[PDB]
Amino acid sequence: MRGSHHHHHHGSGALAALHAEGPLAGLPVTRSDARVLIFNEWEERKKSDPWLRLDMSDKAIFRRYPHLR
């Protein structure tokens, strides 16, 4: 097994916010926090293992995080 995609967009991704209490504890406060958490995770994963694809449609956010609506 061999292959390297070396994706050049490194971003920052640190600005996203989370809920701190109740059933929502650990989850995004906003649509943009959810989008940027998926971006930050993809970018770190991409640095460890370059093959991964970034997907964060509004439907991907509501499927991962059903409280965003």
Backbone as ProteinMPNN parsed JSONL, in Angstrom:
{"seq_chain_A": "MRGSHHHHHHGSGALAALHAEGPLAGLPVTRSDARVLIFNEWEERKKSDPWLRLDMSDKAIFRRYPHLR", "coords_chain_A": {"N_chain_A": [[0.852, -1.229, 0.0], [0.747, 2.126, -1.022], [0.726, 5.703, -1.426], [0.357, 9.282, -1.659], [-1.159, 12.379, -1.16], [-0.688, 15.041, -0.356], [-2.033, 17.593, 0.454], [-2.318, 21.087, 0.261], [-3.711, 23.122, 1.679], [-3.74, 24.367, 4.807], [-4.933, 25.92, 6.811], [-6.385, 27.039, 9.966], [-8.46, 26.665, 12.036], [-9.149, 26.883, 14.783], [-11.11, 28.576, 15.899], [-13.747, 27.668, 16.36], [-16.622, 27.04, 18.453], [-18.015, 25.313, 21.396], [-20.797, 23.803, 23.201], [-21.02, 23.526, 26.79], [-22.369, 22.114, 28.836], [-25.127, 19.871, 29.918], [-27.143, 17.635, 27.676], [-26.08, 18.519, 25.248], [-23.362, 18.999, 25.761], [-20.024, 19.192, 24.648], [-20.624, 19.543, 21.904], [-21.025, 21.485, 18.754], [-21.914, 25.001, 18.9], [-22.959, 26.519, 16.787], [-23.841, 26.467, 13.166], [-21.543, 27.284, 11.708], [-19.492, 26.741, 13.669], [-19.716, 23.9, 13.627], [-19.102, 23.318, 10.838], [-16.4, 24.312, 10.815], [-15.216, 22.733, 12.889], [-15.388, 20.177, 11.584], [-13.705, 20.828, 9.371], [-11.214, 21.384, 10.803], [-10.727, 18.855, 12.056], [-10.584, 17.212, 9.592], [-8.203, 18.476, 8.525], [-6.133, 17.969, 10.47], [-6.282, 15.075, 10.474], [-5.632, 14.707, 7.715], [-2.904, 15.703, 7.836], [-1.805, 13.551, 9.404], [-2.491, 11.272, 7.739], [-2.936, 11.382, 4.388], [-5.024, 10.904, 2.495], [-7.758, 11.498, 3.109], [-11.067, 12.855, 2.479], [-12.702, 16.086, 2.592], [-15.886, 16.831, 3.713], [-18.72, 18.755, 4.322], [-21.471, 19.747, 3.954], [-24.634, 21.461, 4.705], [-26.57, 19.497, 5.378], [-24.743, 17.368, 6.157], [-23.835, 18.577, 8.558], [-26.278, 18.728, 10.068], [-26.902, 15.965, 10.214], [-24.63, 14.929, 11.663], [-24.859, 16.547, 13.987], [-27.672, 16.979, 15.394], [-29.081, 18.955, 16.812], [-28.672, 21.471, 15.611], [-30.416, 22.2, 13.417]], "CA_chain_A": [[0.0, 0.0, 0.0], [1.502, 3.395, -1.168], [0.095, 6.874, -2.056], [0.441, 10.543, -0.9], [-1.9, 13.467, -1.826], [0.01, 16.268, 0.083], [-2.959, 18.727, 0.287], [-1.596, 22.305, 0.656], [-4.528, 24.012, 2.516], [-3.452, 24.029, 6.209], [-5.909, 26.684, 7.603], [-6.138, 27.19, 11.412], [-9.574, 25.861, 12.567], [-9.218, 27.002, 16.246], [-12.149, 29.547, 16.29], [-15.034, 27.003, 16.583], [-17.115, 26.953, 19.826], [-18.754, 24.151, 21.904], [-21.62, 23.777, 24.417], [-20.242, 23.046, 27.942], [-23.258, 21.459, 29.813], [-26.327, 19.14, 29.486], [-27.028, 16.678, 26.561], [-25.31, 19.22, 24.22], [-21.959, 19.117, 26.159], [-19.06, 18.733, 23.642], [-21.151, 19.717, 20.542], [-20.989, 22.855, 18.209], [-22.978, 25.973, 19.198], [-23.476, 27.058, 15.511], [-23.553, 25.893, 11.831], [-20.138, 27.625, 11.439], [-18.655, 25.917, 14.556], [-19.77, 22.543, 13.087], [-18.312, 23.399, 9.588], [-14.986, 24.528, 11.167], [-14.792, 21.505, 13.581], [-15.158, 19.183, 10.517], [-12.484, 21.286, 8.696], [-10.074, 21.208, 11.704], [-10.541, 17.4, 12.075], [-10.037, 16.832, 8.291], [-6.848, 18.994, 8.331], [-5.283, 17.157, 11.348], [-6.305, 13.738, 9.858], [-4.842, 14.913, 6.481], [-1.485, 15.721, 8.251], [-1.443, 12.168, 9.785], [-2.877, 10.343, 6.672], [-3.327, 12.44, 3.44], [-6.095, 10.46, 1.586], [-9.112, 11.806, 3.57], [-11.867, 13.908, 1.818], [-13.433, 17.055, 3.425], [-17.317, 16.966, 3.382], [-19.481, 19.515, 5.334], [-22.771, 20.321, 3.583], [-25.594, 21.726, 5.786], [-27.06, 18.144, 5.698], [-23.696, 16.717, 6.954], [-23.863, 19.196, 9.892], [-27.491, 18.311, 10.798], [-26.739, 14.516, 10.43], [-23.675, 14.782, 12.785], [-25.235, 17.428, 15.095], [-29.104, 17.155, 15.113], [-29.555, 20.141, 17.53], [-28.435, 22.705, 14.84], [-31.722, 22.412, 12.746]], "C_chain_A": [[0.877, 1.264, 0.0], [0.673, 4.458, -1.903], [0.047, 8.093, -1.125], [-0.121, 11.728, -1.699], [-1.371, 14.876, -1.503], [-0.807, 17.568, -0.09], [-2.457, 19.99, 1.014], [-2.39, 23.293, 1.529], [-4.448, 23.584, 3.985], [-4.299, 24.813, 7.228], [-5.447, 27.096, 9.011], [-7.161, 26.384, 12.226], [-9.861, 26.006, 14.068], [-10.414, 27.833, 16.772], [-13.519, 28.948, 16.665], [-15.363, 26.804, 18.074], [-17.998, 25.725, 20.121], [-19.68, 24.522, 23.074], [-20.887, 23.042, 25.55], [-21.038, 22.201, 28.965], [-24.49, 20.786, 29.172], [-26.081, 18.125, 28.352], [-26.181, 17.193, 25.384], [-23.811, 19.357, 24.548], [-21.011, 18.435, 25.146], [-19.446, 18.968, 22.181], [-21.098, 21.192, 20.075], [-22.169, 23.713, 18.659], [-23.683, 26.428, 17.914], [-23.147, 26.193, 14.287], [-22.083, 26.096, 11.439], [-19.161, 26.928, 12.383], [-18.588, 24.478, 14.045], [-18.941, 22.39, 11.793], [-16.807, 23.461, 9.869], [-14.423, 23.393, 12.034], [-14.519, 20.367, 12.588], [-13.904, 19.545, 9.703], [-11.216, 21.013, 9.521], [-9.717, 19.711, 11.846], [-9.979, 16.884, 10.743], [-8.575, 17.261, 8.125], [-5.819, 18.244, 9.197], [-5.152, 15.703, 10.846], [-5.451, 13.722, 8.596], [-3.334, 15.029, 6.761], [-0.982, 14.341, 8.708], [-1.494, 11.155, 8.619], [-3.591, 11.131, 5.537], [-4.562, 12.157, 2.565], [-7.491, 11.041, 1.875], [-9.76, 12.958, 2.769], [-12.618, 14.776, 2.844], [-14.881, 17.188, 2.9], [-18.113, 17.581, 4.548], [-20.576, 20.396, 4.706], [-23.641, 20.579, 4.82], [-26.243, 20.421, 6.295], [-26.04, 17.314, 6.484], [-23.644, 17.263, 8.388], [-25.088, 18.722, 10.668], [-27.544, 16.791, 11.058], [-25.749, 14.193, 11.557], [-24.187, 15.4, 14.092], [-26.723, 17.841, 14.97], [-29.758, 18.35, 15.828], [-29.378, 21.463, 16.756], [-29.649, 23.145, 14.0], [-31.722, 23.484, 11.637]], "O_chain_A": [[1.668, 1.457, 0.923], [-0.002, 4.151, -2.886], [-0.266, 7.957, 0.058], [0.376, 12.045, -2.78], [-1.579, 15.805, -2.284], [-0.333, 18.523, -0.704], [-2.205, 19.965, 2.218], [-1.794, 24.223, 2.072], [-5.017, 22.562, 4.367], [-4.376, 24.414, 8.39], [-4.287, 27.451, 9.221], [-6.78, 25.519, 13.015], [-10.739, 25.313, 14.583], [-10.699, 27.795, 17.969], [-14.359, 29.648, 17.23], [-14.488, 26.442, 18.861], [-18.638, 25.175, 19.225], [-19.384, 25.439, 23.841], [-20.208, 22.046, 25.3], [-20.436, 21.629, 29.874], [-24.849, 21.089, 28.034], [-24.929, 17.785, 28.086], [-25.632, 16.401, 24.618], [-23.05, 19.794, 23.686], [-21.175, 17.257, 24.829], [-18.668, 18.626, 21.29], [-21.122, 22.083, 20.925], [-23.289, 23.218, 18.786], [-24.883, 26.698, 17.943], [-22.295, 25.307, 14.352], [-21.452, 25.186, 10.902], [-18.078, 26.546, 11.939], [-17.507, 23.889, 14.03], [-18.168, 21.44, 11.667], [-16.027, 22.749, 9.237], [-13.231, 23.106, 11.924], [-13.521, 19.66, 12.731], [-13.116, 18.658, 9.377], [-10.246, 20.469, 8.993], [-8.545, 19.344, 11.765], [-8.974, 16.173, 10.759], [-7.772, 16.473, 7.624], [-4.739, 17.914, 8.707], [-4.047, 15.162, 10.797], [-4.63, 12.822, 8.419], [-2.544, 14.494, 5.982], [0.164, 13.993, 8.426], [-0.633, 10.28, 8.527], [-4.747, 11.513, 5.713], [-5.096, 13.082, 1.952], [-8.33, 11.075, 0.974], [-9.081, 13.924, 2.421], [-13.111, 14.26, 3.847], [-15.08, 17.614, 1.762], [-18.174, 17.001, 5.632], [-20.604, 21.612, 4.898], [-23.41, 19.981, 5.871], [-26.442, 20.257, 7.499], [-26.438, 16.607, 7.409], [-23.432, 16.5, 9.331], [-24.952, 18.343, 11.832], [-28.171, 16.367, 12.029], [-25.998, 13.272, 12.336], [-23.975, 14.846, 15.171], [-27.008, 18.938, 14.489], [-30.88, 18.721, 15.486], [-29.89, 22.489, 17.204], [-29.895, 24.345, 13.879], [-32.757, 23.734, 11.02]]}, "name": "protein", "num_of_chains": 1, "seq": "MRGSHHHHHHGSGALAALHAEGPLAGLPVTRSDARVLIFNEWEERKKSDPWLRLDMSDKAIFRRYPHLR"}
